[PDB]
Amino acid sequence: DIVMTQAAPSVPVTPGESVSISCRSSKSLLHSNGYTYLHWFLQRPGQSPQLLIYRVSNLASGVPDRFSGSGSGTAFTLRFSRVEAEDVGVYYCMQHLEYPFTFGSGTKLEIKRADAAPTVSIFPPSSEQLTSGGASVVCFLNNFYPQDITVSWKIDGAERSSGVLNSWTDQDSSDSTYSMSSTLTLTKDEYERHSSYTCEATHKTSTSPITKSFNRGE
């Protein structure tokens, strides 16, 4: 099998500047007929892949002029002349020379922007959930940048780690921020043995943790 390598798992870039992504094959992708069968695909968050460039440097229809490609034999480059916030996604190279066709592991393009503190919102279990014997406390940490953030749950001061479900969105294509959901799941019984529930977030934007909490008995 031909191995397609995309060394960088991601590349940070500022909207407006030029950038390039590389790919290499374990074998020359030149076919007997003179063509080099290497293509580039874009997969935006939650969508299917879409063709960007076929045969090293031919742009597919509908693909923006800012994309270009170059390379020969075993090394290839995809370039953006001016990157846009909308370009967030994973870019893949693929060899279409021999069976089985193979894809590189991809390079995610990350858009750099100004720091942004998360908007933290905490939600006590809904009445509907409590009557059903459940008690999930939800915390949304929305629209922040950079992408890393840490969330710690505190039940009456004591930290909780088990029963925490965490989910993160991909980078937003309009404002380049990130968002995260953290749900602390308890039984209704467990829930009523304590009183203070706290969602604590640590992000580079704050020296101190961003705390949001509420009391079961209120």
Binding site: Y37, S48, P49, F123, S126
Partner: protein, 220 residues
């Protein structure tokens, strides 16, 4: 208008069988070869099989791991291609895409929207939908509401707010799989001048169980 539309995916029993279909339109199907490519967290995009056109003897090619278990076929009169999968294993779980290769050279030119195949003996279970409303008075300028979609299987579920009228301030998060069950959160952020004055409802649909639920976010 070029389109490829997959169907037939969903939850399937390990060792069971399932046939995916792909309906094509908007391009010379007869002049094109058709491929199936799947996507999983473990392998990324993975080529699965190809079937050529009549002129090229309808020849078939398969990736090693599925040879003998999967069968790709096509019906030129219906401009469609199929992938019959048998002896399904956990490693076959993923999103399956149909893509066409017109022979006027263009690589994988067109892709379908994909169909999710989940290999599991678990049962189909509908979600419970719970509204998430703020605890204190809002003010300030904006308010964030949410909906907790819990206890369902398999994926996917579709979540919208006010039937689609509210979408720019929405964040629907990837679902988290717990004990054979998914739990997903969706949040919407609107002006405090919008809610609680105007009704805000999250609409949840779970195709696998034919469940549909509208829940209104009420101030607590």
């Amino acid at each position: 208008e070029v389109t490829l539309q997959e169907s037939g995916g969903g939850l399937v029993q390990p060792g069971g069988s399932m046939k995916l279909s792909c309906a094509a339109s908007g391009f010379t199907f007869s002049d094109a070869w058709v491929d199936w490519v799947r996507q999983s967290p473990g392998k990324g995009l993975e080529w699965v099989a190809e079937i050529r056109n009549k002129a090229n003897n309808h020849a078939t090619k398969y990736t090693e791991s599925v040879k003998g278990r999967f069968t790709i076929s096509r019906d030129d009169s219906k401009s469609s291609v199929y992938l019959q999968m048998n002896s399904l294993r956990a490693e076959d779980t993923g999103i399956y895409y149909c893509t066409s290769v017109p022979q006027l050279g263009r690589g994988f030119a067109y892709w379908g929207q994909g169909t999710l195949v989940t290999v599991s003996a678990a049962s189909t279970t509908p979600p419970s939908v719970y509204p998430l409303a703020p605890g204190s008075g809002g003010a300030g300028s904006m308010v964030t509401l949410g909906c907790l979609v819990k206890g369902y299987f398999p994926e996917p579920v579709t979540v919208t707010w006010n039937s689609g009228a509210l979408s720019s301030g929405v964040h629907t998060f990837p679902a988290v799989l717990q004990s054979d069950l998914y739990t997903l959160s969706s949040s919407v952020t609107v002006p405090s001048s919008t809610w609680p004055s105007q009704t805000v409802t999250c609409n949840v649909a779970h195709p696998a169980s034919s469940t549909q639920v509208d829940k209104k976010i009420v101030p607590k």
